[PDB]
């Protein structure tokens, strides 16, 4: 056991030992991006691959070519912190080495000159942070990985619904990674059809003709030939004995001196037995048999040269004669069979209006570009471009794999484009499938759903960026002169940079981070989506794709999906799941060779799992790893049942591996209804982090894995001992074994301090190690928001009691002790960025001066001389943050107002008050001011105060770094210099800087001292550069938008306690809005005097069936028990042996757990530090499905001297009298969801109004009004509320005149409305009237 | 109009109007240039096209707007903007919203309005009422007063607030009860306080739901809100003359706990002068809330020609029902409370009060039923622990038995005795039966197994366990849901619609395992989707329904007809699926109805 | 059926609400059709008293002054 483990060990129940541990939870997001931006010296996906796809770019046969060499990423213009304050994107510039070649005119390719334009710049591509987010406009965004239909071929049904006859149709769809869609589909008549993209339907033989296939060859392609000989005289037929299966004779079928079947008896196996084994290849047939047969090839009259019968036409009995007498011995006909080999292509050719390649090419072109006339030069080139040009079409390797695999080919790899055989083989399968052999696939199997991510999707966007610079490159190469132009005058960066920018900025797969909370982050990054480009839209797809599918087992979570418009269109990655080599979903299993369960783990893609037999996670095995039971519940081919011991091939890796990170954090989940769990894992991410991080007494174990893997914490790079622990930073003196040879050094972690999140919440880290403490690699040096000692603490545990409380927890409401709001525990800190913008109006420029018209001297008191409030000043709503004044001249005043100007003699201002003022209702402390001034405007007074302070502050940071980093280097010079020449006291008398001169005898230590000097003088010099840069960033003229001259951002630290209206919930889908904040005295207290913190209604438990929340409240009660028991022995100060006796008892508890613990923990410092962290309650781990059992829960309650029933007798603090029946009390972890009421509350008497529709719009001051929709109108109609309705849609909204005749009448004291006509209808007059329609109002 | 940064925005019509003008002007030129007809014909065609894209773009080739891929919004689209586009809604002055919370202290006709919301909402009333009394010289200072929130504006706000109702509206406004008018009560904090009885009408939980507020400005709207939309003027649903202001849950548990009786309790057998001394016996710890007890009560009955005849007796009741009688108003029989009072019986109690005593005595009744219901429900200490969900001892027995039958149905299938379609069908039936067996096994145990003793050996009664009382009363919980906690929870359906032939043998008091929970998932997700979609289909129905009605109004007094439909009880196959008294109550007869004999 | 029965409304302003607004406006403008208001939907669209409830007394006093002197 380790160090942040010696502090606080969670007692974990559960039998099943974890064979595999949780992977790095953000792998999807970081591994994907890694491959987009990375020199990959091969064809693998990347920025390299997108380049090689469109490069080289040659001119229109001009023998002038522009090729690609290499690309580089610069360092970002600002750091991630600066990009958020300033408002910019965290991105790196893309420098791409190009080569321009010009070949000699009419000569064998040799270059006249070639200009190697060094790194032409094409756009900045955004960069992904250490944690998988992007900053796009000072806003953290995550790009959700996408689930689309896999590229390749896919055969669907379309059963039933088509044409109301049943029958079912069959479609094959060739779906590529890029390029046009090629669909083959049947019809009610068994005629074959093709449609490119989703265009018009065309007879499916046209695309074969366009591939240069004659009518004769197509027939030759899809049918076997039935040979008809005219031997001796009058009709024979070459017979395959197998041909007669499924048919009955039409005549005496006699051959070989033995009549096998007479006329009318169906040919069965006995007849095929006889014909086959007696080896009858030729027989005799009547002249009437070929009355319907379809002729295969063409035949002409030999002498005359005239056409007798065309290919694909049905012979008649006289037509037989018409070519029999013309000298034709053989006749080829088709093998047509409605059951076995259907005559589809034969009859399809008769619906085909075309006849040759050029004819087919034309009908394709005119279907694709209709209305406009086709050319031979166009019809040939368009068709070649749709599926055969390496540029306009590519399956990718994922497509060619799924393609060839589904056609039962052997290659997993091949052309990126379609060949003659590719297209034909798909038709050959779709026809075979209708013929009865073969099965369709299904859209919803996760082996035909595929997972993109950021890196892949970005590559596609940068691809589309190049294609539009390809158009421009060739455009210029059309005209170019020689040595004048260079690969720079051609390439335009704004089109490339805005394209890639639009992706990370605004995509249905790129979103905000609505609230900080290490689950929200980590669950968003593991999110999947079937939406956006390449996928379906909400309304297009029904419930079949949204549903949970047997493939989801261990790949996608069945529980954590949102409710609403895209249920099942999201999902979240299963814990142990992984993206396939090709991009499918794989899940871990354990190989079962014969009857032993191995620990060799195999990850199985969706298609792979189907054949095997996988055991269940809850399977009892012991000794050699034999299944204890004779037979185990297993799932194999799509479903689960009991199976034979020595027959299973695999076993689940973990009891968890079905659920997601969000689901895997719900304790006693197996006890919670799947409806309320979905809501549970949905509200869990919505927890705004609390002022003081608690830690869940009732936990599941994943608390560390979620906390650690999202960067909100600060984890040890290398192990060592703490040199210095500030509230600001942390210095770890690295251990030699983990320390690098040169430079030596110490790992220094600068902690994040109170800084703004993606609105409006805060993110602040705290050190969790004390001075001179040993840390190892992977320890938590500093918790973040909602982390305590390295565990996910999204809220705080509350002593809670289930009982009705005078209806103050009526529906699902919550009644809370004042002790909770006294203890500041559900307090929450928010940092709002409020900006102030001095712009450029046509009337003039705006000032930031602290001279404001018509405000008292006390109004300006909080302001400084320059007009900006002081740092640290506590402000409330209305207060002036930045005094700003805008020009408005020639006021055009009224008579009476001018008389007021002459009486009290006030110099009427040319300027209007536009100061940034604190929003009404909100209140907090100013903790930051930033000023960005457009380059050229002189930095004002306070702005220069800030520049000096920021400059001097950053000089302290950079130099404190150097000061600590010189010591760590020089300190190891001391150790190396002393070894072999020890001058213990003699050395540290001469100046320390003078040590570099001292050499050493023949040894590698002289090479080590040389190593440290090298990396020392760079630490000397890398300081100098890192200081200059931070200076240049502060003093540069901050680039602004048009018209804006300077901006002042004030950052407010609002501390928001808890109050009636705040939404709160535990982890089991138990919502609730706190309803009354109550005195500690009225709180139900127990016989001990200890009140309760929250009074929950019991009625919200049965109907809305979240039973796990109760076991939570009982095991939470036992957890607190063991805490107060430790707290007894600790305030009684027994001894380590008395403590260790009881602690060791609690960590064992029950039977057959996977825990194991101490006696080895060193008898003093260790046992005592552990007990202290437990006095608040002993944290417990209920695994997700390997959870604690009632007994182990009741047995923990006994150990704590608490009742097994988990219920006690409670007393009403009001009357003092006892409560009949025992109520439940215990500790339930409860969250605060960021639906805080002082955000949700809005009012508006009169406000602003929109220009076009004189309707309430809501900007500054009193907000927008409430919408009163059609359904609310019916309500008033169902009442008699005629007037209430009229005023609701006249004076109270659209009536520009009555609305102020109302406001004046209200203050006058006359509750009348003088209506008039809404503007909506008055505009409809002018809108109808400004069409050709005369609309009037009649009569009087 | 210009925007910030000096950038401009304009309606798309200007691209459309500009083009028509340009092509018209160019055509006017092409005539004075006497151009060849080949050109002017092409110009005329473009002028035709330009006008068409202005009036209704989309019925040709759909012109695109300048430099932007999107098409331009034509005049025709100014009117739509697809279907039902002029009646989507309009934002309104004098309004607001926030999260709503309880407030059980409220009378039926009131609601808690935040200090802050009521300030901003009535701003023009305060401004006037401020200088109407002279606390402000003029309106300009009046603003600066309520901006300063001087202590006196608060006392003024009560003046404007008193007889001035406000409107409350919750999200999906289904029937007319979705907007109800209440009298405002000035409350601290930012939450809206909602009377718990009107929750049922609104379909409001307190799990984060919000409501909106509106101010009746004109005198009419205040009287309309008071006489038509008031909370207490709509206590019956207009869909079925029954009360929509039923006690919901927390309260019906309270009354069911009161009007209950246990076999041997403190006070068993004493005789009390009246209901008053019965509350005195309970609040002093002498008599138990549920003990069989004779008390002298007086009840009233208006059997006279509109007059309350009194009758006094020693009725055979309990102590709790005695105390509840102190609330029942005047002319109701003591029999109405003498029973066990579940949500079933507790609403019909409320209905009869309206049909017998009238509106006002019903309103003040419902209040007292909630106050007392909440109080004694809170006194009850009703909770819910883990041991409250009692699994039958015979559960594992039933499972193995049906687990045996299926092993035999399988035995028959192996030998070709029974078909695969029969097997799947026959196996589902024995599992369906076993679930019914476990179900009414746990309910047999759960309901009555409280075996107690009175002066003698034994005697058992309806249980007093927490989770049973919740269901038996009707407050919360349903036997279908309870069955999923103690007994096994049903057979689940696999995605395609089949029901899975091995049901979920385990329940929620035990754990479900990976396989069971994974199968429980599809039902849950299709549950959330089905209930999400059927919330849409309904809303499209009420649209189609008001679109065919809307204009229909009670216009004439009596059309004067004898035509009418013959009303009978539905009597569906077995017995009366709906009585006659329900189908015919509240309707007016077409002609004289006669006894079994006539002349009469 | 209700949606087929709803399709037949005298007041074209009511029909231009929920039906296809082009066809209603055209087909009514060729007839020179007069909308008399009278109904609910349209009286809302134009911002006046509903011909029901408290407004029922108003329309009854209005429909009688009309077609009279
Ligand atoms: N009449 C209403 N009754 C009850 N609740 C309402 C009402 N209107 C809005 N809300 C809530 O207010 C926002 C949406 O408001 P809007 O649709 O965007 O419109 P406007 O911007 O103009 O306010 C949601 O609440 P939430 O954002 O908290 O999320 P939720 O929908 O899941 O409850 C709504 O429920
Ligand atoms: Mg709710």
- Per-position DSSP letters for A156-194, written without gaps between them: E--TTTGGGS-----EEEEE-SBS--EEEE--TTS--EE
Contact between B449 and B473 (Cβ < 8 Å): no
Handedness of CA B91, B96, B98, B100 (dihedral sign): negative
| Residue owning the nearest CA to atom 3 of ligand 1 | B171
Q: Which of residues 404-463 of B touch A (CB under 8 A)?
A: none
Token pair listed for B320: 């709790």
Q: In whole angstroms, what is the distance from residue A730 CA to residue A404 CA?
A: 57
Residue reference for tokens 């008399």: C36
Q: How far is the CA of B206 from the centre of ligand 2 (A)?
A: 6
> Taking the alpha carbons of A211, A214, A220, A222 in that order, is the dihedral positive or negative?
positive
Per CB-CB distance under 8 Å, the chain C contacts of A1277 are 40, 50, 52-53
Please give the residue of chain B at the shortest CA–CA distance from C18: B84
State the CATH number of the domain containing residue A843. 2.40.50.150
A565 lines ligand 1 (CB under 6 A): no
Query: Structural domain of residue A856, as residue ranges?
Result: 828-946+1044-1056
Query: Helices (H), strands (E): how many in chain B?
Result: 20, 12
**Cβ count near B385 (within 10 Å):** 24
Task: Give the number of C-alpha atoms closer than 13 A to the C-alpha of residue B427, restricted to the C-beta side.
Answer: 23
d(CA A541, CA A537): 7
* Ligand found nearest the CA of B170: 1
The DSSP bridge partners found for residue A640 are A635
* Residues in a beta bridge with B293: B317
Which one of B172, B206, B494, B551 would you mutate to disrupt binding with A, by most A Cβ within 10 Å of its Cβ? B206
- CA-to-CA distance for C1 and A7, rounded, in angstroms? 74
Distances (CA, A) of A508 to A444, A503, A516, A525, A595: 22, 9, 20, 14, 49
- Residue C22 is nearest to which of B56, B84, B547, comparing CB atoms? B56
The rounded Å distance from CA A248 to ligand 2 centre is 71
Cβ-Cβ contacts under 8 Å for C1 (sequence gap 6 or more): none
Residues 6+ apart with CB under 8 A from B12: B65, B72, B73
CATH of the domain at C36: 1.10.150.390
Residue with the nearest Cα to atom 9 of ligand 1? B171
The string over B520-536, giving b where at least 16 C-beta atoms fall within 10 Å of a residue's C-beta and e elsewhere, is bbbbbbbebbeeeeeee
CB contact under 8 A, B550 and C40: yes
CA–CA dist A1228, B227 (Å, integer) = 47
**Which ligand ends up closest to the CA of B90?**
1
Please report, for residues A697, A800, A1181, B39, the alpha-carbon distance to residue A1119 in angstroms, rounded to integers and kept in the order given: 6, 14, 11, 92
Ligand 1 pocket member B212 (CB < 6 A): yes
- Residue A991 CB coordination number (10 Å): 7
Chain A residues with beta carbon closer than 8 angstroms to that of B167: 1284
Do B102 and A808 contact (CB within 8 A), yes or no?
Answer: yes
CATH of domain B386-534: 1.10.132.30
> What secondary structure, in 3-state letters, does B290-340 show?
CEEEEEEEEEEECCCCCCCEEEEEEEEEEHHHHHHHCCCCCCCCHHHCCCC
| DSSP 3-state of B30 | helix
Specify binding-site residues of B for Mg(2+): 205, 207, 209
B96: nearest CA in chain A? A1243
Cis amide leading into A760 (omega within 30): yes
Contact A521, A131 (CB under 8 A): yes
Contacting subunits of C (3+ beta carbon pairs below 8 A) = A, B
Q: Quote the CA–CA distance of B524 and A568 in Å, as a whole number.
A: 12
Cβ–Cβ under 8 Å, residues A289 and A278: no
Which experimental approach was used here?
X-ray
Ligand nearest to the backbone CA of B210: 1
Candidates B95, B210, B212: which one to mutate for ligand 1, based on the most atoms within 8 Å of Cβ?
A: B210
Q: Which of B219, B411, B532 is nearest to A678 (CA)?
A: B532
| Residue A1211 vs residues A409, B216, B377: alpha-carbon distances, Å | 78, 46, 14
For A809, name the nearest residue in chain B, comparing CA atoms only. Answer: B102
Q: Pick the closest to residue A456 from A27, A32, A127, A38 (CA basis).
A: A32
Residues of A in contact with C54 (CB under 8 A): 1280-1283
Task: Write the CB contacts of B159 (distance below 8 Å, at least 6 apart in sequence).
Answer: B129
Q: Which residues contact A848 (CB under 8 A, 6 or more apart)?
A: A836, A838, A866, A867, A868, A882, A883, A884, A940, A1046, A1048
Main-chain phi, psi angles of A604, to 5 degrees? -110, 120
Gyration radius (Cα) of chain B, Å: 35
Q: CA A639, A645, A646, A648: dihedral to nearest 10 degrees?
A: 30
DSSP three-state, residue A767: strand
Please tell me the number of Cα atoms within 13 Å of A339 on its side-chain side.
5
Task: Give A624 Cα–ligand 2 centroid separation in angstroms.
Answer: 54
Q: Can you list the positions of beta strands (E) in A38-85?
A: 57-58, 64-73
- Which positions of B make up the binding site? 205, 207, 209, 559
Which residues in C lie closer than 8 A to residue A1273 (C-beta atoms)? 44
Ligand 1 probe mutation, B171, B172, B174, B180, most atoms within 8 A of CB: B171
Q: How far apart are CA B20 and CA B48, in angstroms?
A: 9
Resolution in A: 3.6
- List all residues 6 or more positions away from A1133 whose beta carbon is below 8 Å from its beta carbon: none
- Using a 6 Å cutoff on CB, does residue B402 contact ligand 1? no
Q: Are A64 and A58 in contact (CB under 8 A)?
A: yes
Centroid of chain to Cα A1220 = 52
Could you tell me if A77 and A126 are in contact, meaning their C-beta atoms sit under 8 angstroms apart?
no
The three-point CA angle A897-A903-A904 to 5° equals 95
Ligand 1 pocket, residue B169 CB under 6 Å: yes
Rounded Cα distance between C38 and C28, Å, is 17
Could you tell me if B220 lies within 8 Å of chain C, comparing CB atoms?
yes
Q: In terms of C-beta density within 10 A (0-12 exposed, 13-18 middle, 19 or more buried), how is residue A889 classed?
A: exposed
B553 CB within 8 Å of a chain C CB: yes
Q: Six-digit token pair at A413?
A: 């790899």
Buried b (16+ CB within 10 A) or exposed e, A326-339: eebeebbbbbbeee
SS3 category, B213? strand
Which residue out of C1, C8, C10, C16 would a mutagenesis test of the B interface target, given it has the greatest number of B Cβ atoms within 10 Å? C16
Alpha-carbon torsion (B99, A1287, C42, B91), positive or negative: negative
Sheet holding A182-185, edge to edge: A152-156, A171-175, A182-185, A193-196, A202-203
Q: Do C21 and B80 touch (CB under 8 A)?
A: yes
CB B103 within 8 A of CB B195: yes
| Residues 6 or more apart whose Cβ sits within 8 Å of residue B82 | none
CA A936/CA A836 separation, integer angstroms: 19
Residue B211 Cβ contacting ligand 1 at under 6 Å: yes
Which residue's structure tokens are 């290499």? A70
H-type helices in A979-1104, by residue range?
984-987, 1005-1035
Contact criterion met (CB below 8 Å) for C18 and B546: no
Tell whether ligand 1 has an atom less than 6 A from the beta carbon of residue A1267: yes
With a 6 Å cutoff on the Cβ, whether B173 touches ligand 1 is no
- Ion ligand 2 neighbours (CB, 5 A) are B 205, 207, 209
Distance of residue A1248 Cα from the nearest chain C Cα, in angstroms: 21
CA atoms within 13 A on the CB side of A1153: 21
Pairwise CA distance, residues B278 & B326, whole Å: 10
Selection from A395, A462, A390 nearest residue A150 by Cα: A395
Q: After which residues is chain C broken (C to N over 2.5 A)?
A: none
Q: Write the DSSP symbol of residue A30.
A: H
Each residue of A1269-1300: b (16+ CB within 10 Å) or e? ebbbbbbbbbbbbbbbbbbbbbbbbbbeebbe
Please state the φ and ψ torsions of residue A324, each to the nearest 5 degrees. -65, -45
Q: Is B85 helix (H, G, I), strand (E, B) or coil?
A: coil
Q: B300 pairs with which residues across the strands?
A: B310
Cross-strand bridge partners of residue A73: A94
Among candidates A261, A263, A258, which has minimal Cα distance to A272?
A261
Q: Determine whether A1056 is exposed, middle or buried from the number of CB atoms within 10 Å of its CB (0-12, 13-18, 19+).
A: buried
CA distance B403 to B422: 17
Distance CA B437, CA B168 (A): 48
Give the integer Cα–Cα distance in Å for A302 and B236: 98
Instruction: Give per-residue burial for A454-463: e unless 16+ CB within 10 Å, then b.
Output: bbbbbbbbbb
């Amino acid at each position: 056991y380790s160090y942040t483990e010696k502090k606080r060990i969670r007692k974990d129940f559960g039998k099943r030992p974890q064979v595999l541990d949780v992977p790095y939870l953000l792998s999807i997001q970081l591994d994907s991006f890694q491959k987009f931006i990375e020199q990959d010296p091969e064809g693998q996906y990347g920025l390299e691959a997108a380049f090689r796809s469109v490069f080289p770019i040659q001119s229109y046969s001009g023998n002038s070519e522009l090729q690609y060499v290499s690309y580089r990423l610069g360092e970002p213009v600002f750091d991630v912190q600066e990009c958020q304050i300033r408002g910019v994107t965290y991105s790196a510039p893309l420098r791409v080495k190009l080569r321009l070649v010009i070949y000699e005119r009419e000569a064998p390719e040799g270059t006249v000159k070639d200009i190697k334009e060094q790194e032409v710049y094409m756009g900045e591509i955004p960069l992904m942070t250490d944690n998988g987010t992007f900053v796009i406009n000072g806003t953290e965004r995550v790009i959700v990985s996408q689930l689309h239909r896999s590229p390749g071929v896919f055969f669907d049904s379309d059963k039933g619904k088509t044409h109301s006859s049943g029958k079912v149709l069959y479609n094959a769809r060739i779906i590529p990674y890029r390029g046009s869609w090629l669909d083959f589909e049947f019809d009610p008549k068994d005629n074959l059809f093709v449609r490119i993209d989703r265009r018009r339907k065309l007879p499916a033989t046209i695309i074969l003709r366009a591939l240069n296939y004659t009518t004769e060859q197509i027939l030759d392609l899809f049918f076997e030939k039935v040979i008809f000989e005219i031997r001796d005289n009058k009709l024979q037929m070459e017979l395959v004995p197998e041909r007669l299966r499924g048919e009955t004779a039409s005549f005496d079928i006699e051959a070989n001196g033995k009549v096998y079947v007479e006329k009318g008896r169906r040919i069965t196996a006995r007849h095929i037995r006889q014909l086959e084994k007696d080896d009858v290849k030729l027989i005799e047939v009547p002249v009437e048999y070929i009355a319907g047969k379809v002729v295969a090839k063409d035949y002409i009259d030999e002498s005359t040269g005239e056409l007798i019968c065309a290919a694909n036409m049905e012979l008649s009995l006289d037509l037989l004669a018409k070519l029999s007498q013309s000298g034709h011995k053989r006749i080829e006909t088709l093998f047509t069979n409605d059951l076995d080999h259907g005559p589809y292509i034969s009859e399809t050719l008769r619906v085909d209006p075309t006849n040759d390649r050029l004819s087919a090419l034309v009908e394709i072109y005119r279907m694709m570009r209709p209305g406009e006339p086709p050319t031979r030069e166009a019809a040939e080139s368009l068709f070649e471009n749709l599926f055969f040009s390496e540029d306009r079409y590519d399956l990718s390797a994922v497509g060619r794999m799924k393609f060839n695999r589904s056609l039962l080919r052997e290659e997993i790899e091949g052309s990126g484009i379609l060949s003659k055989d590719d297209i034909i083989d798909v038709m050959k399968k779709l026809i075979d499938i209708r013929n009865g052999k073969g099965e369709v696939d299904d859209i919803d199997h996760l082996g035909n759903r595929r997972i993109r991510s950021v890196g892949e999707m970005a590559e596609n966007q940068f691809r589309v960026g190049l294609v539009r610079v390809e158009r421009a490159v060739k455009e210029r190469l059309s005209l170019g002169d020689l040595d004048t132009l260079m690969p720079q005058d051609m390439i335009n960066a704004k089109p490339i940079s805005a394209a890639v920018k639009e992706f990370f900025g605004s995509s249905q797969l790129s979103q905000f981070m609505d609230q900080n909370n290490p689950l929200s982050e980590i669950t968003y990054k593991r999110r999947i989506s079937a939406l956006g480009p390449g996928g379906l839209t909400r309304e297009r797809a029904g419930f079949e794709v949204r549903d949970v599918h047997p493939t989801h087992y261990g790949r996608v979570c069945p529980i954590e999906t949102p409710e609403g418009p895209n249920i099942g269109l999201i999902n979240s990655l299963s814990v142990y799941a992984q993206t396939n080599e090709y991009g499918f979903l794989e899940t871990p299993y354990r190989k079962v060779t014969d009857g032993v369960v191995t620990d060799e783990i195999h990850y199985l893609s969706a298609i792979e799992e189907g054949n095997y037999v996988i055991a269940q996670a809850n399977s009892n095995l012991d000794e050699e790893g034999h299944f204890v039971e004779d037979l185990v519940t297993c799932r194999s081919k799509g479903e689960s049942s009991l199976f034979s011991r020595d027959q299973v091939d695999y076993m689940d890796v973990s009891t968890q591996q079905v659920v997601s990170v969000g689901a895997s954090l719900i304790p006693f989940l197996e006890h919670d209804d799947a409806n309320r769990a979905l809501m549970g894992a949905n509200m869990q991410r919505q927890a705004v982090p609390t002022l003081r991080a608690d830690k869940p007494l009732v936990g599941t174990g994943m608390e560390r894995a979620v906390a650690v893997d999202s960067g909100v914490t600060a984890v040890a790079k290398r192990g060592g001992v703490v040199q210095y622990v500030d509230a600001s930073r942390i210095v770890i003196k690295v251990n030699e074994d983990e320390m690098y040879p040169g430079e030596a050094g110490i790992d220094i972690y600068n902690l994040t301090k109170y800084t703004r999140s993606n609105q409006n919440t805060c993110i602040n880290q705290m050190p969790c190690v004390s001075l001179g403490e040993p840390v190892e690699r992977g320890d938590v040096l500093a918790d973040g928001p909602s982390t305590d000692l390295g565990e996910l603490a999204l809220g705080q545990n509350m002593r809670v009691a289930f009982m009705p409380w005078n209806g103050y927890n009526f529906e699902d409401s919550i009644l809370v002790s004042e002790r909770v709001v006294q203890e500041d525990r559900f307090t929450t800190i928010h940092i709002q960025e409020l900006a102030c913008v001095s712009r450029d109006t046509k009337l003039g420029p705006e000032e930031i001066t602290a001279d404001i018209p018509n405000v008292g001297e006390a109004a300006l008191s909080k302001l400084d001389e320059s007009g900006i409030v002081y740092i640290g000043a506590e402000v409330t709503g209305g207060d002036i943050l930045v005094g700003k004044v805008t020009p408005k001249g020639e006021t055009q005043l009224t008579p009476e107002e001018k008389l007021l100007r002459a009486i009290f003699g006030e110099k009427a201002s040319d300027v209007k008050d536009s100061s940034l003022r604190v929003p009404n209702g909100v209140s907090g402390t100013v903790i930051d001011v930033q000023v960005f001034t457009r380059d050229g405007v002189e930095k004002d007074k306070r702005a220069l105060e800030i520049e000096e302070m920021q400059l001097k502050q950053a000089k302290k940071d950079l130099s404190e770094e150097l000061q600590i980093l010189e010591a760590g280097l020089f300190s190891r010079i001391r150790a190396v210099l002393v070894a072999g020449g020890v001058e213990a006291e003699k050395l540290d008398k001469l100046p320390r800087d003078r040590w570099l001169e001292l050499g050493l005898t023949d040894e590698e230590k002289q090479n080590q001292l040389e190593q440290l000097a090298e990396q020392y003088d760079e630490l000397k010099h890398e300081f100098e550069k890192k200081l200059e840069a931070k200076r240049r960033k502060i003093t540069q003229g901050d680039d602004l938008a048009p018209g804006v001259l300077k901006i002042v951002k004030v950052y407010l630290a609002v501390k928001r306690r808890i109050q009636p209206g705040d939404k709160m919930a535990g982890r089991h889908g138990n919502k609730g809005v706190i309803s009354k904040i109550n005195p500690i005295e009225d709180m139900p207290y127990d016989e001990n005097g200890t009140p309760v913190d929250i009074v929950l209604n019991p009625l919200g438990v049965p109907s809305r069936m979240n039973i796990g929340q109760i076991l939570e409240t009982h095991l939470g009660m036992a957890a607190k028990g063991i805490g107060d028991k430790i707290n007894a022995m600790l305030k009684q100060q027994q001894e380590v042996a008395k403590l260790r006796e009881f602690i060791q008892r609690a960590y064992d508890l029950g039977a057959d757990v996977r825990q194991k613990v101490d006696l080895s923990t060193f008898s003093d410092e260790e046992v005592m530090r552990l007990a202290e962290n437990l006095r608040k309650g002993m944290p417990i781990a209920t695994p997700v499905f390997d959870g604690a059992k009632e007994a182990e829960i009741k047995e923990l309650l006994k150990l704590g001297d608490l009742p097994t029933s988990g219920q006690i007798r409670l007393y009403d603090g009001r009357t003092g009298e006892q409560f009949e029946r025992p109520v439940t009390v215990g500790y339930m972890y409860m969250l605060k969801l960021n639906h805080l009421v002082d955000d949700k509350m809005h009012a508006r008497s009169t406000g602003s109004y929109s220009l076009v529709t004189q309707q309430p719009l809501g900007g500054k001051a009193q907000f927008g009004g409430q919408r009163f929709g059609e359904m609310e109108v019916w309500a008033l109609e169902a009442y008699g509320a005629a007037y209430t309705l009229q005023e609701m849609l006249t004076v109270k909204s659209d009536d520009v005149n009555g609305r102020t005749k109302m406001y004046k009448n209200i203050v006058d004291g006359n509750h009348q409305m003088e209506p008039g006509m809404p503007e909506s209808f008055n505009v409809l007059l002018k809108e109808i009237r400004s069409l050709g329609i005369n609309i009037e109002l009649e009569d009087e | 109009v210009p925007l910030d940064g000096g950038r401009f925005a304009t309606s798309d019509l200007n691209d459309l109007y500009r083009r028509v003008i340009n092509r018209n002007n160019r055509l006017k030129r092409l005539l004075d240039l006497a151009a060849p007809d080949i050109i002017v014909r092409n110009e005329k065609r473009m002028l035709q096209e330009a006008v068409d894209a202005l009036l209704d773009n989309g019925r040709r080739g759909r012109a695109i707007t300048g430099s932007n891929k999107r098409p331009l919004k034509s005049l025709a689209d100014m009117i739509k903007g697809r279907f039902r586009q002029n009646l989507l809604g309009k934002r309104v002055d004098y309004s607001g919203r926030s999260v709503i919370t309880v407030g059980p202290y409220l009378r039926l006709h009131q609601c808690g309005l935040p200090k802050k919301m009521a300030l901003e909402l009535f701003k023009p009333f305060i401004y006037g009422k401020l200088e109407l009394r002279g606390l402000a010289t003029t309106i300009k200072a009046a603003k600066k007063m309520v901006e300063r929130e001087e202590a006196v504006v608060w006392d003024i706000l009560d003046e404007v607030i008193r007889e001035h109702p406000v409107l409350l509206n919750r999200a999906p406004t289904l029937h007319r009860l979705g907007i109800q008018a209440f009298e405002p009560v000035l409350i601290e904090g930012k939450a809206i306080q909602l009377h718990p009885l009107v929750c049922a009408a609104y379909n409001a939980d307190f799990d984060g739901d919000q409501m909106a507020v509106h101010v009746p400005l004109t005198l009419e709207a205040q009287l309309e809100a008071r006489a038509l939309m008031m909370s207490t003027n709509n206590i019956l649903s207009p869909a079925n003359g029954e009360p929509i202001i039923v006690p919901s849950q927390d309260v019906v548990l309270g009354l069911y706990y009161m009007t209950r009786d246990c076999v041997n309790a403190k006070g068993e057998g004493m005789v009390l002068t009246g209901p008053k001394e019965a509350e005195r016996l309970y609040r002093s710890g002498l008599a138990s809330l549920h003990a069989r007890v004779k008390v002298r009560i007086t009840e009233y009955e208006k059997d006279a020609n509109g007059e309350l005849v009194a009758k006094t007796s020693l009725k055979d009741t309990t102590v709790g029902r005695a105390i509840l009688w102190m609330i029942v108003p005047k002319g109701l029989p003591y029999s109405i409370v003498n029973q066990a009072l579940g949500k079933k019986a507790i609403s019909k109690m409320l209905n009869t009060c309206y049909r017998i005593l009238g509106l006002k005595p019903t309103v003040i009744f419902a209040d007292q039923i909630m106050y007392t219901g909440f109080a004694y429900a809170a006194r009850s200490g009703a909770s819910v622990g883990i041991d409250d969900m009692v699994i039958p001892e015979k559960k594992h027995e039933i499972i193995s038995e049906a687990e045996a039958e299926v092993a035999e149905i399988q035995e028959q299938f192996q030998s070709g005795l029974v078909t695969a379609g029969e097997r799947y069908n026959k196996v589902i039936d024995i599992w369906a039966a076993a679930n019914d067996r476990v179900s009414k096994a746990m309910m047999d145990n759960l309901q009555t197994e409280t075996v107690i003793n009175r002066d003698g050996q034994e005697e058992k009664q309806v249980s007093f366990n927490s989770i049973y009382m919740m269901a038996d009363s009707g407050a919360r919980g349903s036997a279908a849901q309870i069955r999923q906690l103690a007994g096994m929870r049903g057979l689940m359906a696999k995605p395609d619609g089949s029901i899975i032939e091995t049901p979920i043998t385990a329940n929620f008091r035990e754990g479900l395992n990976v396989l069971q929970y994974f199968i429980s998932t599809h039902g849950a997700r299709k549950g959330l989707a089905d209930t999400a979609l059927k919330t849409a289909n309904s809303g499209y129905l009420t649209r189609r329904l008001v679109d065919v009605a809307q204009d229909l109004v009670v216009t004439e007094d009596d059309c004067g007809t004898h035509e009418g439909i013959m009303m009978t009880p539905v009597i569906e196959g077995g017995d009366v699926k709906e009585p006659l008294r329900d189908r015919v109550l509240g309707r007016v007869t077409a002609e004289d109805v006669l006894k079994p004999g006539t002349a009469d | 059926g209700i949606t087929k029965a709803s399709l037949a409304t005298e007041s074209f302003i009511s029909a231009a609400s929920f039906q296809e607004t082009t066809r209603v406006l055209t087909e009514a403008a060729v007839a020179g059709k007069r909308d008399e208001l009278r109904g609910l939907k349209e009286n809302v669209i134009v911002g006046r008293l509903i011909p029901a409830g408290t407004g029922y007394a108003y329309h009854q006093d209005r429909m009688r002054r009309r077609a009279a002197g």
